[PDB]
Design a protein around this ligand. Structure first.
Ligand SMILES: Nc1nc2c(ncn2[C@@H]2O[C@H](COP(=O)(O)OP(=O)(O)OP(=O)(O)O)[C@@H](O)[C@H]2O)c(=O)[nH]1
Ligand SMILES: Nc1ncnc2c1ncn2[C@@H]1O[C@H](COP(=O)(O)OP(=O)(O)CP(=O)(O)O)[C@@H](O)[C@H]1O
Ligand SMILES: Nc1nc2c(ncn2[C@@H]2O[C@H](COP(=O)(O)OP(=O)(O)O)[C@@H](O)[C@H]2O)c(=O)[nH]1
Ligand SMILES: c1ccc(CNc2cc3c(cn2)[nH]c2ccccc23)cc1
Ligand SMILES: [Ca+2]
Ligand SMILES: [Mg+2]
Ligand SMILES: [Mg+2]
Lengths: 427, 437, 334, 54
């Protein structure tokens, strides 16, 4: 089962690039695309993300999208820049000016068909395409506006394929422009309808983690992206390496998503580590379990103690006692069974993979479907309303053809999403 | 002689089929290439083992089996496995994308595009049969294929083969081994749809096999391989009377006669003893009395429940190894005075005993030790309904919130089938209670 | 940090137990339908034993023995005794009883009393009390539910001052190992009406229940005489003790009853574990012979003894399985 | 107590011991239900493509 990767916009391409940088190192694939590992567990699930190229070369099934050439030229001149299929570089020239409308309705519309042609060309080769994954931010114009336009048009042409996203949430602590709450809200409406799994990566959380925890006075986007590539690598581990789990994206989605609109996940990761700073002490399993469940390790600035877990997925990596893992996992649930819903039996599932990430001897990745995620959406909704009650900065959008009603609708749908999460928090 | 066709559906069914046929071959002295030196009727025969194997002119002994999965990777490991030459391609059938642990997807959506093919490949086996008794169907309750495609198949077989019997080997879902969360939905659905189409079903709770593997084989975390080699032993005990000379349970019809007095209540509890570790340096061989006594210990049952708080309708004892009727009758007499064994008033309180002198065969390099005598008890006790109660409760919890339901409805299924299936199960729980108290 | 649940709110004994557990600061109460518990304080009716011991990573314990109702209900107890060889119909400490279904053990019931008609032997029975069988044979028929008719002790031991009737209540705890623990503190639930050998058409005189007598508070507060008193009265008025004259027979009847059904309810090798508190109700005749009247599966305690007993339950039945970071019981050995 | 129907052979023997005496849908509806569920999908797929067309 093959996956098609797409990365849209500045944020989208920068985390996406570092993702391919990380997992290409895991799979032993080099900057040119030649395998150079020791294990062959490196290769029997490598067609999931890579295409086999003549000359024993491997090429990412990756499509790079932007309305500006700036970031994608940085990617191409980046460390693993030349690994990517050059035709998969689809870009405009005007940019989106952090404007959802430009990305979704005007500038992006002009470019979207060209992108879909590259998608179609990839899907055609896939013996059994299982789904798509997108990397983008929701605060800008391209990744937000055009990214959701792509998702909408991909669902039209592939209604029966899984669509997952890694979606970076905006935050005033890490902000480019004031209109990010507007762009975010418009995009959430789109994600609620047309995605199976959306990993909610809050820039607030990524910041706090870098400063409060990781001893970084002034964290850059590069530091923030260390955390994101580590997490993306962890959530996809089970699909990239052989193990216990005989599951595709669909089977995995079925067991995580009891309700179609409630598919926004809190990612987490342990041990939390800065880049450069070595780790000499390997965590015990009880430490891995304790940390990956602690809020300070969550990538979404939500307090899981303010909600209840609908489902939970956990992926331990490295050489460890599978027994001890079960005890510690079963321990946490039996410790705090009040923070798990009782009306979904056995809703916490675990998997183990013998291959650890680079630099760590063992690690865990947390995927939580908590109702506490409403805190994230309430946050955006407040920032949205504060401006919208005065119709502030709205001319940037109405100048591209949008009406106020579309904002009112988007606002309502997210307040609905919030109220829906609240319904199951009191069940 | 009358032939039996084994149908293995889904991952659990396939990999368990592998375990069984591997074991069968060892018990009949058939090698991986299908050659059976001891068979002197080259090219054919009328023997008891021909119940499960047919013969080619070249002298190959091929299973009367069909493997079917909605996704290739599991059966591909049969196409390239050590017993690859044993089967032939038309016996192994694979779709491209599985049912994603979705009953509706396996039954309705993806089931439809492959049902006519499987029945054809099955019909090609039945045409090689001079007298077909019926089918042995291996599958999981929790898998979308194992649950959804099985009920679809079981419906058609009752149409294409009305007079033929159909037995089930069913894997009851356990959280310790499972990973799906929706297996209770799949289990209730497939039981509801298969109930009138199954003459006799042997439930195996992965929870029970798992603990048996930990407790008695000293395996810290059992793999499917560990579970399946133990399950194959039990299944081999249950089917030995179809593959070997004897007078007890010689055809599928007798299984229902001896074990299933009332059709709906056709879930006999299996209990197996002794299970001994091969890495166990020092072992004291157990007696007919000891292994027979172990048959009334809950820790040896395929499903954990308490037969003391229910009633029996039937009870077969199948022995393998050094056993004589005299020792059995003494062991039975002793146990009865010490244990609580209540039958229903309209049943004779007695035991049907089968003995095969050949002791149980073990897979070389397996976890199980060779023993001088072993036994499998098949008891139709109402206590097994505890397993239905567990399952039905989990179903109720999720369904009250309609959790995950949208996955099924999105495949064309109606929400009404959920409630219908659950009401049928609610009836089934009461059938057991009428009889049991 | 262990966890437990409460599914019986009317339990005067285990509401007290739940309180003690929380006070240790090492137990946590979940809600009725949370499966991830260590201990279950279940309901009296339709308790789902079939769902216990199937939670991975959890040792589970319940405060009831499945199947123990065959001892704790009148129709069953009679059948239990009569059919069980270790007890038999020759059993010397159970009043001659018979099972009687409404319009079975009626034809036999008639035969037993037919010499009692003309044997010039004491011929009074109880379901209520009567000398005429016909009068209560279709009192049962007017009620609707199956009844038990039983030998009536018309020559009971009588407490003076007062010339009164009484019954003894013993609290027994059976832990997970099937150790049978007798609570050293019992209670006499005494009548205050002088026992009337003639007219039993009243209830107060021949029925010693704690409810129906509310002659209350005359000789002892509560109509409730404890063992220190009853022992003293025995020493002064009959020159014997409680242990010798009565308790040996009590410990013998208790042990005989639970050992009879041990192989039917024991959780020795089960996936879940049981314990349970029982209340045995005895009665003494004038020859100091103790008769078993009944066994209560869901017994309530005496108010002075709640604190001590309920603390004992935690010590040997719960903490014995779930340990934390001289004895009030008498072990009946076997 | 009473052993009956003792059958013996080289492979083994079998008998019965009594300790106490006592005291379908046609292919009509299958393919009808399968197709009635198929156009429940088609209807759902149509309303999606309609919704997307809007
Ligand atoms: N005993 C045993 N159980 C298994 C085995 N494989 C899977 N299972 C159980 O089967 C259930 C999942 O069903 P599967 O058989 O894997 O699913 P399937 O029939 O292939 O159907 P799909 O959903 O389409 O994959 C879980 O409860 C597993 O514990 C096996 O080899 N042995
Ligand atoms: N055979 C008998 N002879 C004399 N008195 C008897 C008797 N059977 C019952 N009694 C009287 O009836 C009282 C209680 O009746 P019984 O025990 O049958 O009902 P009960 O269940 O309400 C007691 P508990 O409620 O504590 O279980 C006894 O305490 C005793 O006073
Ligand atoms: N984590 C992370 N967030 C980013 C990065 N670049 C931009 N963002 C966030 O994304 C939003 C801006 O979107 P951007 O991708 O730059 O707009 P676009 O290129 O037009 O789609 C803001 O909320 C930024 O904080 C990045 O490299 N990493
Ligand atoms: C793109 C591609 C792939 C992924 C990962 N998806 C995923 C993984 C798991 C899951 C639900 N979804 N449930 C699990 C339980 C145990 C182990 C793993 C998982 C996201 C984006
Ligand atoms: Ca032959
Ligand atoms: Mg930018
Ligand atoms: Mg499968």
């Amino acid at each position: 089962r093959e996956i098609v990767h797409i990365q849209a916009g500045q944020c989208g391409n920068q985390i996406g690039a570092k993702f391919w940088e990380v997992i290409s190192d895991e799979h032993g694939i080099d900057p040119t695309g030649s395998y150079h590992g020791d294990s062959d567990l490196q290769l029997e699930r490598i067609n999931v993300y890579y295409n086999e190229a003549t000359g024993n070369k491997y090429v990412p099934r990756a499509i790079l999208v932007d309305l500006e050439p700036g970031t994608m030229d940085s990617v191409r001149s980046g460390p693993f820049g030349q690994i990517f299929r050059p035709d998969n570089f689809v870009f405009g020239q005007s940019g989106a000016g952090n404007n959802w409308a430009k990305g979704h309705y005007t500038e992006g519309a002009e470019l979207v068909d060209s992108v879909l042609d590259v998608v179609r060309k990839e899907s055609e080769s896939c013996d059994c395409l299982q789904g798509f994954q997108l990397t983008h931010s929701l605060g800008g114009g391209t990744g937000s506006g055009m990214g959701t336009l792509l998702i909408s048009k991909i669902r039209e042409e592939y209604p029966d394929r899984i669509m997952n996203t890694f979606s970076v949430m905006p935050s005033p602590k890490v902000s480019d422009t004031v209109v990010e709450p507007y762009n975010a809200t418009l995009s959430v409406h789109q994600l609620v309808e047309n995605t199976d799994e959306t990993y909610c990566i809050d820039n607030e959380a990524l910041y706090d983690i870098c400063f409060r925890t990781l001893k970084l006075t002034t964290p850059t986007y590069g530091d923030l992206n260390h955390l994101v590539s580590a997490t993306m690598s962890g959530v996809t581990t089970c699909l990239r390496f052989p193990g216990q789990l005989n599951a595709d994206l669909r089977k995995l989605a079925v067991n995580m998503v009891p309700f179609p609109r409630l598919h926004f996940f809190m990612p987490g990761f342990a041990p939390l580590t800065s880049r450069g700073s070595q780790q000499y002490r390997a965590l015990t399993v009880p430490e891995l379990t304790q940390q990956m469940f602690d809020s300070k390790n969550m990538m979404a600035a939500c307090d899981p103690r303010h909600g209840r877990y609908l489902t939970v997925a956990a992926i331990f990596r490295g050489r460890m006692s599978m027994k001890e893992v079960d005890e510690q996992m079963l321990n946490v649930q039996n410790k705090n069974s009040s923070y798990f819903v009782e009306w979904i039996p056995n809703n916490v599932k675990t998997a183990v993979c013998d291959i650890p990430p680079r630099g760590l001897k063992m690690s865990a990745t947390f995927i939580g479907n908590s109702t506490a995620i409403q805190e994230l959406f309430k946050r955006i909704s407040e920032q949205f309303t504060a401006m919208f009650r005065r119709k502030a900065f709205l001319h940037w959008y109405t100048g591209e053809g949008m009406d106020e009603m579309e904002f009112t609708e988007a606002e309502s749908n997210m307040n609905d999403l919030v109220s829906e999460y609240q319904q199951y928090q009191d069940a | 002689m009358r032939e039996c066709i084994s149908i293995h559906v889904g991952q659990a069914g396939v990999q368990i089929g592998n375990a069984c046929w591997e074991l069968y071959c060892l018990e009949h002295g058939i090698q991986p290439d299908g050659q059976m030196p001891s068979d002197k009727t080259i090219g054919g025969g009328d023997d008891s083992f021909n119940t499960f194997f047919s013969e080619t002119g070249a002298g190959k002994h091929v299973p009367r089996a069909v493997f079917v999965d909605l996704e290739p990777t599991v059966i591909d490991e049969v196409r390239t496995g050590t017993y690859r030459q044993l089967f032939h391609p038309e016996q192994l059938i694979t779709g491209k994308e599985d049912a994603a642990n979705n009953y509706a997807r396996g039954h309705y959506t993806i089931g439809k595009e492959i049902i006519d093919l499987v029945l054809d490949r099955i019909r090609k086996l039945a045409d090689q049969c001079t007298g077909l008794q019926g089918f042995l169907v291996f599958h999981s309750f929790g898998g979308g294929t194992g649950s959804g495609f099985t009920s679809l198949l079981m419906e058609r077989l009752s149409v294409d083969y009305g007079k033929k019997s159909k037995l089930e080997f069913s894997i009851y879902p356990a959280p310790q081994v499972s990973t799906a969360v929706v297996e209770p939905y799949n289990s209730i659905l497939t039981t509801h749809t298969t109930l009138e189409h199954s003459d006799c079903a042997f439930m195996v709770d992965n929870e029970a096999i798992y603990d048996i593997c930990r407790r008695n084989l000293d395996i810290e975390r059992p793999t499917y391989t560990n579970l399946n080699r133990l399950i194959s032993q039990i299944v081999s005990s249950i089917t030995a009377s179809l593959r070997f000379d004897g007078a007890l349970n010689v055809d599928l019809t007798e299984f229902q006669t001896n074990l299933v007095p009332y059709p709906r209540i056709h879930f006999p509890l299996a209990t197996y003893a002794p299970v001994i570790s091969a890495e166990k340096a020092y072992h004291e061989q157990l007696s007919v009395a000891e292994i027979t006594n172990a048959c009334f210990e809950p820790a040896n049952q395929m499903v954990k429940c308490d037969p003391r708080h229910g009633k029996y309708m039937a009870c077969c004892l199948l022995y393998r190894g050094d056993v004589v009727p005299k020792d059995v009758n003494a062991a039975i007499a002793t146990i009865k005075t010490k244990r609580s064994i209540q039958f229903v008033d309209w049943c004779p309180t007695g035991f049907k005993v089968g003995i095969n002198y050949q002791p149980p065969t073990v897979v070389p390099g397996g976890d199980l030790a060779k023993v001088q005598r072993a036994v499998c008890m098949l008891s139709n006790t109402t206590a097994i309904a505890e397993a239905w109660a567990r399952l039905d409760h989990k179903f109720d919890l999720m369904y009250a919130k309609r959790a995950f339901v949208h996955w099924y409805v999105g495949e064309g299924m109606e929400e009404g089938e959920f409630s219908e299936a659950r009401e049928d199960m609610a009836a089934l729980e009461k059938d057991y209670e009428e009889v049991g108290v | 940090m262990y966890t437990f649940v409460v599914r019986d709110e009317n339990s005067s004994v285990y509401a007290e137990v739940s309180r003690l557990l929380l006070a240790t600061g090492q137990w946590k109460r979940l809600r009725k339908d949370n499966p991830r518990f260590n201990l279950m304080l279940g309901e009296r009716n339709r308790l789902p034993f079939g769902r216990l011991g199937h939670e991975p990573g959890l040792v589970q314990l319940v405060n009831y023995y499945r199947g123990a109702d065959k001892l704790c209900r009148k129709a069953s107890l009679v059948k239990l005794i009569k059919t069980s060889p270790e007890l038999s119909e020759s059993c010397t400490w159970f009043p001659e009883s018979y099972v009687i279904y409404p319009t079975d053990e009626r034809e036999v019931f008639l035969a037993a009393y037919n010499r009692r008609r003309e044997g010039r032997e004491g011929n009074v029975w109880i379901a209520l009390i009567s000398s005429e069988a016909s009068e209560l044979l279709d009192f049962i028929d007017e009620q609707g539910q199956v009844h038990v008719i039983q030998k009536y002790l018309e020559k009971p031991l009588l407490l003076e001052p007062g010339h009164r009737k009484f019954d003894i209540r013993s609290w027994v705890l059976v832990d997970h190992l099937y150790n049978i623990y007798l609570y050293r503190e019992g209670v006499l639930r005494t009548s205050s009406e002088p026992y009337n050998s003639a007219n039993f058409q009243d209830k107060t005189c021949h029925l010693t229940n704690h409810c129906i007598q509310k002659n209350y508070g005359r000789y002892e507060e509560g109509n409730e005489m404890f063992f220190e008193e009853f022992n003293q009265y025995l020493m002064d008025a009959l020159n014997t003790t409680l242990e010798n004259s009565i308790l040996l027979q009590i410990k013998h009847i208790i042990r005989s009853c639970l050992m009879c059904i041990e192989p039917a309810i024991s959780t020795k090798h089960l996936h879940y574990q049981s314990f349970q508190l029982f209340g045995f109700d005895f009665m003494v005749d004038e020859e100091l012979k103790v008769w078993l009247i009944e066994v209560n599966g869901a017994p309530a305690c005496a108010q002075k003894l709640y604190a001590e007993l309920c603390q004992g339950i935690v010590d040997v039945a719960i903490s014995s399985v779930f340990p934390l970071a001289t004895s009030i019981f008498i072990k009946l050995h076997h | 107590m009473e052993v009956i129907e003792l059958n013996k052979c080289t492979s083994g023997q079998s008998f019965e011991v009594i300790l106490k005496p006592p005291s379908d849908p046609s292919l009509e509806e299958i393919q009808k239900k399968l197709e009635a569920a198929e156009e429940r999908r088609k209807y759902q797929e149509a309303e999606l493509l309609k919704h997307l067309a809007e």
